């Protein structure tokens, strides 16, 4: 079975953990829809000596963007949401932006791929509480657009707060309630917004290093202003379920009524996993950014050279935490299409409670190891 | 030995824990300078399932006042502090105060016993960081006095922040460093100010109940504005050491003639006696039969009528912080001639209790536990 | 079996390793002269995935100073070295010095305890190879004194290479050969000077953190210019043997007259006593309570106040080298009449810790581990 | 399969390892573009008992020259570099030179085949760090030319530092980043410059024998003054990929619907033609061409040894030796119409022992694997 790739993956995890000095790390690897590995190293709570384990929940920062994109796709399929219309139809509160003396239009399709003119404020240590997304909009609504929309890519987090407001306006219900329903459908029974008052079991702590090269606690923050693009807590097992559901929907149309319908239509998944031009993927130079995901295509330019592998990932970095979720579909031959059943691929999710750690390469290597073994 | 009082005290702890619904509680009982019991029930961290244990650190709201009293007494003994001079001699920042048209004086001994006119603002959920007590003084400096100083008792917490500023001015060093030196001298190795950035091992979590009768986490707070009262974390074994040191300092004077090779107390016997004499025109909130000495609640010994209850002498202090409650109680024993001649101080029982639940009265339970352990003495 | 103590220590090691982010750590604990625990956590070589183990050899920085003081003590006992004569008798290469108005005398004993005027150059990343200590003396021989000798304490490392030159001059043999003889006598079969060319088995790698908070390799350095301080590599098992020998030499005289079949110590009881006596006007950086005895940090026993902290007597030394930290600590036990009458030396606990991470304070952790092992005893 | 040639090749590796007394050796053999064998014998770290394995990274000394020649060929194809103009057009820092009292000119193509007048300095145990090749040029810029350029061959390594400076000037970017892009394209994900500070996983140790015939560690050296020749750390699997890319580029021109080579077939054939008045050290039969020792195909007399055509390169660094060898197969009509490039065998060997010649062993292993083929 997989008794060889597990040791190699554990070695890789120990490598990254020693390189960044993370107090703890958690990994989950699922192959072909079955969870084959789930490991935890280190301590989730250094003060109370709580070990890391599969049940540990941690901050996921940018995976929230993919989770919100799922809601956007559901609204698009239901017909309540149009991507090409300007967002002022949904949100009159957002002012009609004008760039350099010419009226420009900001649309959902343009703003999902971070292609709008909204500038990147960066990490802000807000400790305030926001009740609804419309109130959260006041942080950046008055500010002008940095670029001309549709002309330049600029990674921004408040754009997905605007997307959450759009979800509230279109779905007719609260954004948090809609995402809770989506999580219940996807069986992600532990994914929940990051808030202080409720008792959330197996909640980890998030650390950083100070100027004396010592491990300390991160400052208290409230991610209410950005439940999208941040503010979500989950286990590795829930990210595995999310990735497996996404992969199944993508491959279901190709596979041929024993097969159940995919969460989203095959066309929706195809649209969601196509890279857009003039757009770059920060954590992988070979890939581009597509619909709240980063997509690397298959291409071999020259003979006997590097052949890229098609995969879709997303890395998130929150205050005192880092995470990655990566999906690697397998090559679909005629025989497997004839006799095998989707999903056919590998989903790897890695989360650590240490700031500014790049976990894309480790996830890619672990996925490649488990793909080598397959069987 | 104490195999009977332990079970009774554990039953009392279970009683109070089930009555208030506290997630966890920790108790420490020390008899005659030797720690004889240290127990923890429940969970210190409900989310991560961390059990309570003697090593758990929790918030002590009003014990900090007695800890600051230790520093003030040391400064008085060193001659650097005068209790009768007005506080403006030490801190010029504090404005002069006039009450219905006559100027009044705020003095150290008066503001210790909460007899000054500074009003009680109550608990304020501050999240701001304060560097020194001087900048912390801006929260209440401009407000006028509520009462005539020396005429009425009104429990207050910012008065001890003013006291911390006075300690900084008098000792010539930072208040936190002075208290660290004092804790090092007293062997309280886990007493530390409550701040978020450093890694403090065995830190507990503090809970409350919401309007739906469910357990929730308390809001994040920063207690830098009041390091002097409510600003410290400690274990039960550290409060036991503090109480044992205070008891030894209080009793060494009587026991001196018998051995004459006894180490001196941390403070002079006269200083401890002054510290544990209740002041008149003052009330003790958590015990009606006592008064409020210097940063302590003292219940005297007296029997007004024959065949009637006789008050037992003891000195306690209870505190309530956000999501936590605590008590520290010292019960000295009656000193016969035989024990003065043949025994060695301290002779008494110190009981400390800490629970991670808001607004819990642990004074009566501590007194009952102390009485159990006293009955089964030797 | 000291199981509870072992577990507590493992927890403490994990605590310090996580706090500093050290790739690997190795501990050795010896109780009453028998080696009771030896553990290694992490990786000695991160690139090649080599785990830490008791056989791992790491840089010991300032323990080399105690090892050199052993040689100086042997020369003192043999009568070949005078601690009061000026060093210019042994090393004419070192020039005579005048501090301000008057000429001054630098002696062996005054220079052992860092009380001379030699200023602290700090760590220099020198890659040049030195053959003999005389040519190593060229780095600081011309420079004047920073203070008047005997008037101020200043920690220095080049004082100990001057001591190595003194050892060569007095003994008449090479310093490395004399230290090799001493290591062979004490059964420290792994301790050796740190050099690149020879094949030293189980050699570890030493790491640091860069400006991007990533683990990187420390720059290549050559430690030939300071063999006496910072020039040696050893395991924890060798430091345990060294500490056991020192403790036995310290306690053999006390245990005399009872089962006096006792073998003599390596160093005379008077020599060990004067070795572990603190000197005044001198400080010990890694413990404020202690002072600096010759090549050692000594904390004496004292209780100023009743029911207050009582200081425990112990002798340690911590060292920090490029990419490595280490500590060696000796905690003797108090000698009652029964243990002197029946037991046999050594009676104490020795703890040695080495980690391949720069700027780590391991003194407090080692003291805590020693305290746990002393609690368990039996 | 190849279950017979593997045993013979292992025997040959044992022979060379025992003859030179190397602590460890690593081999990689790729047949027809697919890696068929990869083995490691001995210990990469004698002190810590770390065995040699296919993932071990070791120093490659003169294979860096071929890697740099790949960048030079890319610049040549892009039109940014002209070989025949004097190098002073690219690098004004290099002074104009007189030999025997007359002006002489040094060109890039003359400098590639070591035909220039730059003298051979040999191994220097430097420990200084150089930021860029421009300051690295100070080691040999002032010294006059030993021979008249174009008149006699002299193996020199600082000429490739000059070539790295030329690459920096011409490409408009740093030499290191250009080579990194080339490595990433070629799928050589383990090749990296040899530096001390960063953590390089599976880094080996390099040994030597002292005057007492005992194994000791080599002195610490810094190869920053020699990034272009030397100063590179790669596995055998990376050299296999490099050789496969070169062979495919060499053969795709002769061979439907195939992906193009990394370099044009004209560029590859220009790379693998020997230059006259030039000698190949590790094989007296062949000559030295464009950072590749090439042995041509020729039978002088009937019923006598026929020379087999191949291209190799050996390198010797402080405490390490390496060889990369490419043996193309003879292409008849059947293999042209029924097969896909690359057809041939690539053999790479690396050991951590100073002054070891591994060319003969690599050639023998390639010949064994060519015998079996199938």
- C-alpha distances (whole Å) from A130 to each of A134, A135, A136, A164, D304 are 9, 7, 6, 13, 91
Tokens of A162: 């605007």
Q: Which helix (H) or strand (E) holds A25?
A: strand A24-31
D63 touches chain A (CB under 8 A): no
* Cβ count within 10 A of residue A237: 20
The correct CATH number of A5-62+189-373 out of 3.40.50.300, 3.40.50.1220, 3.30.565.10, 3.40.710.10 is 3.40.710.10
Give the single-character DSSP code of C333. Answer: P
Q: Do C202 and D47 touch (CB under 8 A)?
A: yes
Q: Mutate which of C7, C46, C213 to test chain A, going by most A C-beta atoms within 10 A?
A: C213
* CA C162/CA C62 separation, integer angstroms: 15
C18 touches chain A (CB under 8 A): yes
**Residue C208 forms beta bridges with which residues?**
C216
Residues 6+ apart with CB under 8 A from D266: D253
Tokens of C319: 């060292």
* Cβ count within 10 A of residue C125: 10
B212 touches chain A (CB under 8 A): no
* CA D63/CA D282 separation, integer angstroms: 14
* CATH number of the domain located at residue range(s) A69-177 in this protein: 3.40.710.10
Residue corresponding to tokens 């979500």: A232
Tokens of A310: 């098609």
* CA B314/CA B335 separation, integer angstroms: 14
Nearest to C75 by CA among C60, C63, C90: C90
Residue corresponding to tokens 């917490």: B157
What angle do helix axes C175-185 and C158-171 make, rounded to 10 degrees? 90
A219 touches chain B (CB under 8 A): yes
In C, which residues are within 8 Å of B33 by CB distance?
307
Which residues in chain A are immediately followed by a break of C to N over 2.5 Å? 256
Q: Which of D9, D30, D62, D113 is catalytic?
A: D62
**Is the Cβ–Cβ distance between A233 and A60 less than 8 Å?**
yes
By C-alpha distance, the chain A residue nearest D251 is A303
Q: Do D217 and C196 touch (CB under 8 A)?
A: yes
Q: Could you tell me if residue D163 is left (phi over 0), alpha (psi between -120 and 50 degrees) or otherwise beta?
A: alpha
* CA A194/CA A200 separation, integer angstroms: 9
Distance to chain C for B34, nearest Cα, Å: 10
Task: For A89-136, give the secondary structure using H, E and C.
Answer: HCCCCCCCCEECCEECCCEHHHHHCCCCCCCCCCCCCCCCCCCCHHHH
In A, which residues are within 8 Å of C359 by CB distance?
213
What angle do helix axes C63-78 and C158-171 make, rounded to 10 degrees? 30
Please, what is the end-to-end C-alpha distance for chain D in angstroms?
7
* CA C229/CA C360 separation, integer angstroms: 18
Q: Which of residues 227-256 of A touch B (CB under 8 A)?
A: none
| E-only strand ranges, B101-214 | 102-104, 192-193, 207-209
**Nearest beta carbon to residue B346 from set C303, C305, C307:** C307
* CA A281/CA A118 separation, integer angstroms: 18
Residues 6+ apart with CB under 8 A from A154: A114, A117, A118, A119, A120, A146, A147
CA A204, distance to chain mean position in Å, is 19
What angle do helix axes C363-376 and C3-20 make, rounded to 10 degrees? 170
Q: Which of B62, B113, B136, B171 is catalytic?
A: B62
A306 touches chain D (CB under 8 A): yes
In B, which residues are within 8 Å of C8 by CB distance?
none
* CA C52/CA A213 separation, integer angstroms: 22
* CA C151/CA A302 separation, integer angstroms: 77
* CATH number of the domain located at residue range(s) D5-60+189-372 in this protein: 3.40.710.10
To the query of whether residue D62 is one of the catalytic residues in this protein, the response is yes
Residues 6+ apart with CB under 8 A from A207: A23, A46, A215, A216, A217, A218, A320, A353, A354, A355, B199
Question: Which value, to the nearest 10 degrees, does the dihedral of the CA atoms of residues C237, C242, C247, C250 take?
Answer: 170
By C-alpha distance, the chain C residue nearest B186 is C308
Distance to chain C for B151, nearest Cα, Å: 38
In C, which residues are within 8 Å of D235 by CB distance?
none
The set of chains that have 3 or more CB pairs under 8 A with B is A, C
> What number of residues does chain B have?
378
C15 touches chain B (CB under 8 A): yes
* CATH number of the domain located at residue range(s) C3-60+179-376 in this protein: 3.40.710.10
Question: Which value, to the nearest 10 degrees, does the dihedral of the CA atoms of residues C167, C170, C172, C174 take?
Answer: 10
Q: Do D241 and A304 touch (CB under 8 A)?
A: yes
DSSP string, A159-193: HHHHHHHHHHHHHSS-HHHHHHHHHHHHT--S-EE
Tokens of D1: 């399969």
Q: Which helix (H) or strand (E) holds C339?
A: helix C337-342
Q: Could you tell me if residue D32 is left (phi over 0), alpha (psi between -120 and 50 degrees) or otherwise beta?
A: left
**Is the Cβ–Cβ distance between A263 and A186 less than 8 Å?**
yes
Q: What is the resolution of this structure in A?
A: 3.1
Nearest to D163 by CA among D136, D144, D182: D136
Enumerate the domain spans of chain B. Answer: 5-62+180-375, 68-173
Maximum Cα–Cα distance across chain C: 63
**Is the Cβ–Cβ distance between C282 and C152 less than 8 Å?**
no
By C-alpha distance, the chain C residue nearest B34 is C307
Maximum Cα–Cα distance across chain A: 64
- C-alpha distances (whole Å) from C29 to each of A236, C40, C236, C244, C377 are 40, 12, 9, 11, 13
By C-alpha distance, the chain B residue nearest C307 is B245
Strand, helix or coil at B161? helix
| CA angle (A114, A118, A120) in 5-degree steps | 85
Strand, helix or coil at B58? strand
* Cβ count within 10 A of residue A259: 13
| E-only strand ranges, B235-357 | 291-292, 297-299, 314-321, 324-332, 348-355
* CA B64/CA B130 separation, integer angstroms: 18
Nearest to D286 by CA among D323, D311, D267, D269: D311
What angle do helix axes D158-171 and D63-78 make, rounded to 10 degrees? 30
* Cβ count within 10 A of residue B140: 18
Strand, helix or coil at B176? helix
**Nearest beta carbon to residue C309 from set B33, B186, B252:** B186
Q: Which helix (H) or strand (E) holds D372?
A: helix D359-372
**Is the Cβ–Cβ distance between C343 and C7 less than 8 Å?**
no
* CA D196/CA D204 separation, integer angstroms: 12
- C-alpha distances (whole Å) from B149 to each of B105, B146, D315 are 7, 9, 92
> What number of residues does chain C have?
378
> What number of residues does chain D have?
374
CA D164, distance to chain mean position in Å, is 15
Q: Do A302 and D260 touch (CB under 8 A)?
A: yes
Tokens of B46: 């409900």
The backbone torsions φ and ψ at residue D179, rounded to the nearest 5 degrees and listed phi first, read: -65, -35
Q: Mutate which of D40, D48, D56, D218 to test chain C, going by most C C-beta atoms within 10 A?
A: D48
Tokens of A1: 């079975």
Q: Mutate which of A21, A47, A204, A206 to test chain B, going by most B C-beta atoms within 10 A?
A: A47
D47 touches chain C (CB under 8 A): yes
Q: Which of C62, C234, C316, C326 is catalytic?
A: C62
Instruction: Tell me whether the CATH fold assigned to A5-62+189-373 matches the one assigned to A69-177.
Output: yes
Strand, helix or coil at C320? strand
Strand, helix or coil at A42? strand
Q: Do A303 and D248 touch (CB under 8 A)?
A: yes
* CATH number of the domain located at residue range(s) C68-178 in this protein: 3.40.710.10
3-state helix, strand, coil in chain B (%, to 5): 35, 20, 45
- C-alpha distances (whole Å) from B291 to each of A56, B119, B157, B288, B317 are 50, 20, 18, 8, 11
Nearest to C375 by CA among C352, C354, C353, C349: C349
- C-alpha distances (whole Å) from C79 to each of C92, C171, C197 are 20, 10, 37
**Is the Cβ–Cβ distance between C239 and C251 less than 8 Å?**
no
DSSP string, C139-208: GTSSS--SS-TTS-----SHHHHHHHHHHHHHHSS-HHHHHHHHHHHTT--S-EE--SSS--TTB---EE
The backbone torsions φ and ψ at residue D148, rounded to the nearest 5 degrees and listed phi first, read: -70, 130
Q: Are strands A232-234 and B215-217 parallel, antiparallel or unpaired?
A: unpaired
Please, what is the end-to-end C-alpha distance for chain A in angstroms?
7
* Cβ count within 10 A of residue A340: 13
Question: CB-side exposure of B22: number of CA atoms within 13 Å?
Answer: 33
Q: Do A213 and C18 touch (CB under 8 A)?
A: no
Q: Do C305 and B199 touch (CB under 8 A)?
A: no
Tokens of D274: 């020997």
**Nearest beta carbon to residue D260 from set A15, A19, A303:** A303
Q: Do C214 and A23 touch (CB under 8 A)?
A: no
By C-alpha distance, the chain D residue nearest C219 is D197
In C, which residues are within 8 Å of D201 by CB distance?
47-48
* CA B290/CA B302 separation, integer angstroms: 11
**Residue A50 forms beta bridges with which residues?**
A45
Tokens of B349: 């029982």
> What number of residues does chain A have?
375
Residue corresponding to tokens 């159940």: A260
How big is the B-C interface in CB pairs under 8 Å? 42
Chains B and D touch (3+ CB pairs under 8 A): no
Q: Do C18 and A214 touch (CB under 8 A)?
A: no
**Is the Cβ–Cβ distance between C234 and C57 less than 8 Å?**
yes
Strand, helix or coil at B315? strand
| CA angle (C66, C72, C78) in 5-degree steps | 140
Q: Do C305 and B262 touch (CB under 8 A)?
A: no
Class of domain B5-62+180-375: alpha beta
Tokens of D345: 């065998």
**Nearest beta carbon to residue C215 from set A21, A42, A43:** A21
A209 touches chain C (CB under 8 A): yes
Tokens of C248: 């036995």
B200 touches chain A (CB under 8 A): yes
Technique used: cryo-EM
* CA B78/CA B72 separation, integer angstroms: 10
**Is the Cβ–Cβ distance between A360 and A295 less than 8 Å?**
no
In D, which residues are within 8 Å of C47 by CB distance?
199-203
**Nearest beta carbon to residue C18 from set A11, A23, A356:** A23
């Amino acid at each position: 079975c997989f008794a060889r790739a597990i040791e190699s993956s554990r070695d890789l995890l120990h490598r990254i953990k020693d390189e960044v000095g993370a107090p703890g790390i958690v990994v989950g690897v699922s192959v072909d829809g079955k969870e084959v590995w789930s490991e935890g190293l280190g301590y989730a709570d250094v003060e109370n000596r709580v070990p890391c384990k599969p049940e540990t929940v941690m901050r996921i920062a940018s995976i929230s963007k993919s989770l919100t994109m799922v809601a956007l796709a559901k609204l698009w399929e239901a017909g309540k949401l149009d991507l090409d219309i300007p967002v002022q139809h949904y949100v009159p509160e957002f002012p009609e932006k004008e760039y350099e003396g010419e009226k420009v239009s900001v649309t959902t399709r343009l703003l999902i791929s971070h292609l709008s003119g909204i500038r990147h404020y960066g990490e802000l240590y807000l400790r305030e509480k926001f009740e609804n997304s419309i109130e959260s909009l006041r942080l950046f609504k008055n500010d002008p657009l940095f670029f001309k929309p549709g002309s330049q890519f600029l990674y921004s987090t408040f754009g997905y707060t605007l997307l959450a407001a759009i979800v509230e306006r279109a779905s007719g219900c609260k954004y948090l309630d809609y995402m809770q329903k989506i999580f219940h459908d996807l069986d992600m029974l532990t994914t929940v917004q990051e808030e202080n008052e409720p008792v959330i079991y197996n909640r980890a702590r998030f650390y950083v290093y100070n100027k004396k090269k010592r491990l300390v606690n991160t400052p208290y923050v409230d991610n209410s202003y950005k439940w999208a693009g941040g503010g979500f807590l989950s286990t590795v097992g829930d990210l595995l379920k999310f990735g497996n559901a996404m992969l199944y929907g993508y491959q279901v149309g190709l596979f041929k009524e024993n097969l159940l319908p995919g969460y989203l239509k095959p066309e929706t998944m195809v649209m969601m996993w196509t890279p857009v031009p003039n757009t770059e993927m920060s954590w992988d130079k070979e890939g581009k950014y597509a619909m709240a995901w980063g997509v690397v295509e298959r291409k071999q330019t020259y003979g006997s050279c590097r052949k890229q592998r098609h995969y879709a990932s997303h890395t998130g970095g929150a205050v005192g935490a880092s995470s990655v979720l990566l999906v690697l579909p397998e090559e679909l031959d005629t025989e497997t299409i004839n006799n095998k059943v989707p999903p056919r691929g590998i989903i790897v999710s890695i989360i650590c409670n240490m700031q500014s750690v790049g976990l894309n390469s480790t996830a890619l290597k672990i996925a490649l190891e488990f793909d080598k073994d397959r069987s």
